[PDB]
Symmetry: C4
Subunit: 277 residues, 4 copies
């Protein structure tokens, strides 16, 4: 009904960054990921791999003590802020980060919202997903706030029932991005990327291989990394959603859509990303 344009291959090619010969890890920044809890530890690994695969310089993972050891053998490149997501509830961050994500595998609690409020006082883009998504408002700040709800989380945020939401996805996503003054990545087939300045796009990539636990955790990480290597954070969000879906399309060329595991999207991204360079 709205004619929201697709973010196309041509837009991706035109906007993906270079990685210059004269750069070091500091050029691409240090990200922070606040993710993973004792009965949902895997979401931290998924998002971690997503982020380190996606062109950042360094990654600090703020997760519980019990989760740390489960990440290290698979993602040895990350370092840790021990019990970081709980510690973020107590004070403003003393360290400076290029971008921050919070929520995958975190309980949807008031302590998590406190950590959200502290993270928002930093001057960098911030992603809120999963356990960090709630019905709330957002303080005026410099850097973008990026919310990544699936339709269930959108219902939690807005009170718009899922059955109604799904009939008018882009209309609701635009309306709430504007009201909240946040980016909203409203997930699903034809994911909507709605910006608080009124720009809105649809994502043309992805398939049912993504309809399985963990794929959104991986996406949150991909957005986190891309925010560190793109000059324009809009392009980071758009390219992460696009390339995330493109990795699922590569998988289905020679593998059944029923059989993808989320972490494999990260394994596939190196070759898919190269295609768009």
């Amino acid at each position: 009904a709205m004619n929201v344009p697709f973010w196309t291959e041509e837009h991706v090619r035109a906007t993906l960054p270079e990685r210059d010969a004269e750069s070091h890890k500091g050029t691409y920044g240090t990200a922070l990921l606040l993710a993973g809890s004792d009965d949902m530890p895997g979401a931290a690994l998924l998002a971690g791999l997503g982020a380190m695969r996606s062109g950042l310089g360094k990654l600090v993972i703020g997760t519980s003590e019990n989760v740390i050891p489960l990440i290290v053998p698979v993602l040895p490149e990350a370092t840790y802020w021990r019990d970081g997501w709980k510690k973020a509830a107590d004070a403003q961050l003393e360290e400076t980060y290029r971008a921050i994500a919070i929520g995958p595998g975190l309980p949807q609690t008031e302590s998590v919202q406190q950590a959200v409020d502290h993270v928002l006082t930093a001057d960098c883009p911030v992603i809120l997903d999963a356990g960090a998504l709630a019905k709330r408002t957002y303080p005026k700040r410099e850097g973008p706030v990026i919310l990544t709800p699936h339709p269930g989380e959108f219902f939690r945020m807005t009170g718009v029932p899922v059955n109604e939401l799904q009939k008018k996805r882009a209309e609701y996503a635009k309306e709430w991005a504007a009201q909240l003054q946040t980016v909203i990545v409203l997930k699903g087939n034809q994911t909507v990327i709605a910006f608080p300045d009124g720009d809105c796009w649809l994502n043309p990539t992805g398939n049912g291989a993504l309809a399985k636990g963990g794929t959104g955790d991986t996406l949150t990480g991909m957005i986190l990394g891309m925010l560190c290597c793109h000059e324009d954070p809009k392009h980071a969000v758009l390219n992460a959603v696009y390339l995330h879906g493109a990795c699922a399309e590569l998988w289905t060329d020679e593998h059944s859509a029923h059989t993808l595991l989320a972490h494999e999207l990260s394994d596939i991204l190196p070759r898919v990303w190269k295609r768009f360079e």
Copy 2:
């Protein structure tokens, strides 16, 4: 002697499900796996990988605290019900699952049977394997009960000695599926899939590469996942047994039958499944 028909490539092709563009993980359900104990932890990873590879939406693994960390780095997509198989002995499940499996790597104890009795009060298909297999009867309930004995476990269930069983496999499997009113997947070369309504099939795939620890644990998981994406639970069971054996046949094209490890069946399934689409 009986002319039990084979479930053939043509039957598999005709019955494997689609994964629609307009679906999400909830479309394919949340399964529960109750598996893994302190000296047999690996069976939980094997069955977990089997299940997540096999087209479910989400997987919760109910296993002991000591087993959880051993699964997460390999299968980060699963979440946990901490000490779940022990907790299931104490009360009906409060959560709703699309399908449930119990038994791989569990001790063959009365506490495990209590957990079985509680799981059976849910309205979903239930698989019982390994430590959950015992001589018993089953309450009338809506969803199918699927027993996956090898010949030793069948002897434990029925008192039919293995030497006698193996002379008349389909006859015994049919007789006991009918008596018990359960599906029986009687494993071995030419696995028998006997339904309590009298339908019975033989499986034509598989080889001696499967004659090694863990392959039945992986199968239980494959059945669990397929029950979540097939509309007809009969087809889920049949296709899981078939594709399980087909992965062993792919392996032996270029690898010795002596050298397969069970977890690799799960790694092979993506490409094998695609062949049948």
Copy 3:
């Protein structure tokens, strides 16, 4: 000086076993591996992978509590006898095994020799390696005892200095196999396989890619598995040593000899073994 014959490709092809369609894991037996200690845990994983890759039915790993979790994510198919190598020092094994190995990554202590003495009362082939190798004698028993010393361990066993040993390898290996009434696999370039009945062979495969920590741990496991699927335990030993070296030769076709890691021999064996079928 002696004309000890090489165990050749033709001997390997003539002696490798079939894996029949009508077999199950019990056909190929349950092996026991007593290996791994707190500061040398990896040797248990190396030998475990070697063994499960090499055609056994099941593998029980008797290792310390702290080592168990380090094996499970990589080799989920093994089960455990918790603190098994220490417990073996206290009594004869109550369980029956198709073959047993002891020593990789175990401290060279009197407690380990006690565990050796208990294992020797079983009726199955037994391999002694590494920490289980000492200067001693062996009781008359039914099954073969297989010692796998490198030249340093041979010096420890016999008092023959390494410099002298290495001038007359097959002569010393034969002499001591006869004296001890054990098989001796005297490792090195042109490994000597000396039988206590006077048969003796040289191994023609392998290269300097093997000259790195862990490769002998992997070999001990390969011998353990092959003893379970070969009818003649002589052929098991000969084929394990041969195929172990052949995997290093495959590696060097496209990879530098400086860069092999022991666990990769196990990864390579599936395709190498197939070549000899």
Copy 4:
């Protein structure tokens, strides 16, 4: 301005060692790596893999108790000196090593400098990286001391600000190698390898795929291993830096430069090294 020559493909080919048929792990020595701490554990795995991939015989990793289990499943070939880097602060090493590295993932503390002072009393080449880099002087000793600073660490060592350093990299690196009487590998695009005898080279390989956490940790390990298989420790340093960068160039043929993870350099080295033989 200086015409520092590049260490070229031809120099690498002329200087890489053979791995003779008549060698064993002892021929290539035992290295010691003192690396990894509770919130930076991964650096020990990265450097460990680097080292074992790079032609040593054995590797002992001296790291904290909590780090050990995180390494073993990925690098089972290493053994451990439990809490080794802390224990090295208390006394001269009783064991003899072919080469030693210290610092990746270690806190930059006085206790680490004490461990440095003890390691320096050994007669072998010693690498100091990361947490072991400080403003200090070095005792006259037989074996080379090899410092591997990035420009930030060089500033910490010398007081030369990074902005000034980067205008005259080889001039500063030569000056300080001479003053300190240490090798300095001054990292960055066109890494400078400055020897205390006045030889100096530039490295022509590498790209922005390396501009991400962990790649320097992997390099320290590669240098450690190469010091064990090269007769001339100068060639070890030069070839490690060259081949490290070459692995990043192989990656970018078919993968985006944004997406490399440090541990993958180690995975790539087997095939890259073979190219130069």
